[PDB]
Amino acid sequence: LSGGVNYFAADPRIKNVEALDKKLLAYLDKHGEDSTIGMRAIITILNAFTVDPNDLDLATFKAALLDFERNQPHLTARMVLRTNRKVNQGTGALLSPTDQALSRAEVAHPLLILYRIEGVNDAAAQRGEPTWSSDPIWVPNIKLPG
């Protein structure tokens, strides 16, 4: 993982879908879709995900965040939560044109963008096309500063 590059999980899995979804949606209401958030809270959210290291290396990213904690204790992560997203699994891309520009413009804060995708699996699975591991799903996109 190099700085200044977006990485998103192509095929994420959630340990407990309802618990994470309830958690993220409660956060979205309480704190907004675009906020800053402490490192430990980011980590906790990331731990709710299971992703193959070759797809998205969450361990390394988390390690990088902890390094930021020790080196820059005041540094916070930026978190963007989008809902009602409609992206099919396996298309090779996640972010909207707006979030592309957003992430390119963010060069100070470690950035986590979460996309909530719902009501997409049935149509795709009915026509034998790739599906997300759950409905609804949250898809993570990370970007380190630099």
Comparing C-alpha atoms, which of 54, 62, 43 is closest to residue 11?
54
Q: Is 60 exposed, middle or buried (0-12, 13-18, 19+ CB in 10 A)?
A: middle
Comparing C-alpha atoms, which of 66, 68, 67, 85 is closest to residue 24?
85
For residue 85, list its beta bridge partners.
117
How far apart are the C-alpha atoms of 136 and 80, rounded to whole Å? 17
Given a contact cutoff of 8 angstroms between Cβ atoms, the answer to whether 141 and 3 are in contact is: no
**Exposure string over 87-113, b if 16+ CB within 10 A, otherwise e:** bebeeeebbeeebeebbeebeebbbbb
CA distances from 115 to 19, 68, 91, 127 (A): 16, 25, 15, 23
Given a contact cutoff of 8 angstroms between Cβ atoms, the answer to whether 131 and 121 are in contact is: yes
How far apart are the C-alpha atoms of 82 and 114, rounded to whole Å? 6
Query: In sequence order, what are the residues at sequence separation of 6 or more whose Cβ sits closer than 8 angstroms to the Cβ of residue 133?
Result: 11, 12, 13, 14
**Reported structure resolution in angstroms:** 2.4
